[PDB]
Amino acid sequence: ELTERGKLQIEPESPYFDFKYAKNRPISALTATPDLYLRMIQAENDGLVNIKVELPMLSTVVDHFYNILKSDGTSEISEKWNALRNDAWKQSLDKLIPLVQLNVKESIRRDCERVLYFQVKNSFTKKIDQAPYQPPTYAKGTIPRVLTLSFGEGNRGDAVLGVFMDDSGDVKSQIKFDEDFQSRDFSDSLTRYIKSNNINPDIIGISGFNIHTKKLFDKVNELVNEERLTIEYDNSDKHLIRVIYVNDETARLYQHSSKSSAEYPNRPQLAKYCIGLAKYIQSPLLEYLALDESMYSLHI
C-alpha cells in the first residue's frame, strides 16, 4: 500500500517505482530476488509504502476452525452460544493476525538478508580472485617487472608520467615526458627509455580518468608494434611486451592515502597513482589489503 508520501514521492525514475503497485507477489519467489524485498522494506521505513501479507484462503481456515469449535445445537439458545463463540473467534483472529504477519515478515527479511550476504560474499571473492600477470616463458605465480605510463586527463598541459617497478616491488626509476604524446619526440624518448636503460619491463599498464587515455593506449600499442620491443629473456621467437588497461580503484584510493605520502614524501600524486597501478599488477591481493577500511566503500 502507498501512503500520501508514497503517493507523491515514488517517481518513475526512483528505484522504488518497481513496486509502486505490486500485488499478490508470491513469498516463495522472494528469496530468489532478495533485493526487491529489501528495497520494499527500505521504502516502508521511509514512511512511503506499507507492506501487507494476506492469504487467499484465510476464510477457509476461519471456517474450518469455526466448524471445529462451533456446537451442533439448533435451538435458539444454541444459536446464541454459537454466535458468541464465533464473535469471540473473530476477535481472536483480529488480535492474532498482526503478530503472525510480523513473524512472517521477519522470517522473509532474514532469509533475503542471508541470500544477499552470500551473494555479496561471492561477488567480493570473484573480485579479489586473480593471480598476478604471468609473463610468457615463465611459470605461474612469478612476479613480473612492470612499467606504468599515465597522464590523467589529457587537457592541453597534461604531461605523461612513467613509473617502472621491478619484480622486487621497489621503485627503480621515474621519468617525465614533457612533449606532446602525438609528436615523434615522445615516441623517440619512450623508445630510448625502454631500450637504452636496460629497463626491459615485462608488461606495460595504461590507465586514466577519461577517454583521452584511449588515444595514448593506441599510440603506445602502435609504437610497440612498430619498434618490435620484445621482452628480454635471460639465457627463438621473442615475444612482444604486452600493453593493457589496468583497473584502478586501489590506485585511485592509494593516490590519496597518507601511506603513500609517508612512503614517498617527494613524489607527485600521479607518480603515486602509477605506483599503485604497478603494485596492483604485481599483486592485486596485497593492494586490496592495503585499503584497510576504504575497501568497504568499493563497488562490490
Binding site: Y133, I211, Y245
Partner: peptide, 16 residues
C-alpha cells in the same frame, strides 16, 4: 588463483 583478468570492451567502456 585464476590468471590476471583482462578487461573487455564493456569493462573498458565502463572504466573510461
Amino acid at each position: 588463483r585464476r590468471d590476471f583478468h583482462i578487461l573487455n570492451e564493456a569493462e573498458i567502456f565502463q572504466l573510461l
